[PDB]
């Protein structure tokens, strides 16, 4: 049984690998080298948001591209007004070890999660005028690393117990649980259609899941270390991964293989956050070197370095209209970066 | 600014004031992380007390200790959060030599962690009485698992304050030096490991954790004034 089974696995993997080789008929490089390069993307610190007293661990732009929510080990979950650097809300978290935060598409709710293995949903728009926790989603046997609302009542959370789960806020029970990862899941990225969602795990692999089907569809390998952050191409047919091996990788949902590796000998630290631009031509990517290096998605050429921060760029994010980039770091400063002509 | 943006700015100022007050209130406590094996008896260290937070006060200084139970077997990818802790209280069972090598491996992994390159470690050798009884009986030999013990002799000019036979002192200092070798093989002086000995019944563990956070904080103060 174990012999024949591993044998089956081996020959199946052989098929997958060889099938992938077949597809490879060219490279993104040999198909993109004839296009004009982006040039040099220079970004200034257009706004600095301060008030946190500890390392910022996550951020998430609202759907209006104006409000963002930042979570830090201070124990607070602030709702910034990025246009005027005003703190709309300051939610005191039950546990001061938050590792992720999320803003619902509706703008009505926010979520936080950390080492308490509980996702707390806060009702920002309440009649009493105070943001109070509306539901605590317990049932995870590991630290929470990422959470994303589906529309307003389903939230997909990835924990350190090698499982990702789809929740029902009204009932508080896991509608569907996703298994298959052999290591801690560090990030997830919902597709624009909110029908598929990927997850980057510490097993140096990424899996494409289906929220309705409840099981994985594709798996992707090629990273030499843990995947700290993952994103999604705006078209929904590709995604990018940020690993600890200092190389970003762009995968595809159809060719089922990596496309281009964003590497440089100057940088040896791992990528902490990966965020795509509105058009998908620019690949923002934070690094542990305190610098967010902007990568050309179709060229793997460093267009620019957002060099402002003083400790690891911990979270990233691009507005829904693509008008700004917000990078949060362990120095408690959240800086909004915008490009000027 | 309009009349509704001036009031919004006033609300933001009040939020800032509350945040600063909360930060000032929370800055008076020292944060610690307790790490160790299942048989290490980690919980029993400070005695009279997903994260089992333990708060004890000594010399009018409030200590916060975060025992991260459950989670998964690995201690990585969650230890990034504990980058600002003053010290790490590593507890290891020194009486079970079968799992002693894996304890050395765990300590090596903790010491060489990239995010703990500046966080000191307060190491506790738990189960002193069991170790003494085991080496007194002689049924289990330390040299059986560690061949270098037989050639190793007692450290010259040591400090064996309690009145035990040379075998107990030799074994205790052998384990202590085994941990210290990994402690000093790296860190380049940015952080140091303080080894102690715990009998699983002593109530002075809090004092040792304090007297040692006064040399972790003193070293940090020396580094701010560039006097080190």
């Amino acid at each position, epitope marked *: 049984e174990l012999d024949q089974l591993r044998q089956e696995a081996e020959q199946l993997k052989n098929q997958i690998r060889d099938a992938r080789k077949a597809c490879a008929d060219a490279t993104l490089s040999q198909i993109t080298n004839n296009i004009d390069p982006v040039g040099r993307i220079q970004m200034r610190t257009r706004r600095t948001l301060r008030g946190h007293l500890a390392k910022i661990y996550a951020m998430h732009w609202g759907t209006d591209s*104006r*409000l963002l929510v930042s979570a830090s080990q201070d124990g607070k979950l602030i709702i910034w*007004d990025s246009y*005027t650097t*005003n703190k*709309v*809300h300051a939610i005191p978290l039950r546990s001061s070890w938050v590792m992720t935060c999320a803003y619902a598409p509706s*703008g009505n709710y926010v979520a936080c999660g950390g080492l308490d293995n509980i996702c707390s949903i806060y009702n920002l728009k309440t*009649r*009493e*005028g*105070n943001v109070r926790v509306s539901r605590e989603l317990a049932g995870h046997t590991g630290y929470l690393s990422c959470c994303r609302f589906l529309d307003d009542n389903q939230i997909v959370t990835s924990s350190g117990d090698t499982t990702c789960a789809l929740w029902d806020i009204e009932t508080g029970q896991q509608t569907t649980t996703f298994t298959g990862h052999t290591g801690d899941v560090m990030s997830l990225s919902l597709a624009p259609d909110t029908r598929l969602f990927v997850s980057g795990a510490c097993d140096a692999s990424a899996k494409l899941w289906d929220v309705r089907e409840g099981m994985c569809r594709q798996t992707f390998t090629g990273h030499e270390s843990d995947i700290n952050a993952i994103c999604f191409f705006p078209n929904g047919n590709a995604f990018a991964t940020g690993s600890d091996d200092a190389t970003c990788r762009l995968f595809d949902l159809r060719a089922d293989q990596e496309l281009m590796t964003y590497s440089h000998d100057n940088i040896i630290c791992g990528i902490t956050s990966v965020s795509f631009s509105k058009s998908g031509r620019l690949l923002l990517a934070g690094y542990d070197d305190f610098n967010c290096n902007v990568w050309d998605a179709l060229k793997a050429d460093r267009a620019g370095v957002l060099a402002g921060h003083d400790n690891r760029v911990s979270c990233l994010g691009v507005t829904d209209d693509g008008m700004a980039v917000a990078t949060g770091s362990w120095d408690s400063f959240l800086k909004i970066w915008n490009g000027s002509s | 600014v*309009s*009349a*509704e*943006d*001036k*009031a*919004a700015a*006033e*609300r933001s100022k*009040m939020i800032d004031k509350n945040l600063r007050e909360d930060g000032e209130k929370a800055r008076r406590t020292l944060r610690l992380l307790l790490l160790g094996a299942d048989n290490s008896g980690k919980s029993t260290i400070v005695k009279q007390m997903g994260i089992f937070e333990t708060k004890f006060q000594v010399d009018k200084v409030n200590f916060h200790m975060f025992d991260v139970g459950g989670q998964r077997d690995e201690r990585r990818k969650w230890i990034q959060c504990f980058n600002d802790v003053t010290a790490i209280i590593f507890v290891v069972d020194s009486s079970d030599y079968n799992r002693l090598q894996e304890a050395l491996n765990d300590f090596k992994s903790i010491w060489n962690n990239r995010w703990l390159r500046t966080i000191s470690v307060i190491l506790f050798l738990n189960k002193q009485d069991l170790l003494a009884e085991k080496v007194l009986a002689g049924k289990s030999k330390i040299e059986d698992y560690f061949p270098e013990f037989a050639r190793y002799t007692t450290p010259e000019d040591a400090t064996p304050e309690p009145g035990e036979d040379p075998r107990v002192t030799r074994a205790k200092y052998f384990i202590r030096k085994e941990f210290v070798d990994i402690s000093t093989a790296s860190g380049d002086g940015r952080h140091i490991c303080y080894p102690h000995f715990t009998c699983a019944v002593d109530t002075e563990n809090a004092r040792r954790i304090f007297n040692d956070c006064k040399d972790i904080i003193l070293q940090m103060n020396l580094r701010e004034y560039n006097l080190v």
Partner: single-chain antibody
Amino acid sequence: VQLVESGGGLVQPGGSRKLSCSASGFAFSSFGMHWVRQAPEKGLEWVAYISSGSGTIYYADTVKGRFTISRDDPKNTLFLQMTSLRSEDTAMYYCVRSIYYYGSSPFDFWGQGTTLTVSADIVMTQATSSVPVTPGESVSISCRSSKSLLHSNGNTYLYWFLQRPGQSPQLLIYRMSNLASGVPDRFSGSGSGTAFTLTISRLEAEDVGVYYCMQHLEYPLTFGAGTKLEL
């Protein structure tokens, strides 16, 4: 969410009266509170306002000095000390809460009100005061301001209120575009920086009342003359 105001009887001219507004059901300390009067058989006008934390206090030019405001956070009570009352001061004083952040709904809840009987401002004009209309059709309520309420931030600060007969004013639309919570989708608002209109698609029996305009670009807050909707 409930505001009860007590302490209004009859006061001789030139006397002193203390008003109390009891708050219970929401975070009182986080809400800025206003005092709004309403003379009998007349419109309503702003009187005083104290921000959250008692930071900034603004009084209308006709009540400055004579009236002093004071809130009490520990037991959620709003006070309005009255000195040297005049014969024109007899009005029903309303207790209104207002929270100010990005996307909030100021002047959302109004108190029951207490009756008192004494023995450079943007004037909002509502030329039409009585529109006899039947349920089922659509009625448009117009407003106009001397100063363009449109601000550089992109928000036109004009609010609307509904005063049912023998009731308290209820917020319908804030910032001229956003519908208040609980208001039916039948109400709609539009206009420009100077011209403002209020439109109702389908009108039911509960829409009978007086509609008042509102301005929030500048501290002196001014209401409209009102537009009664007779059945």
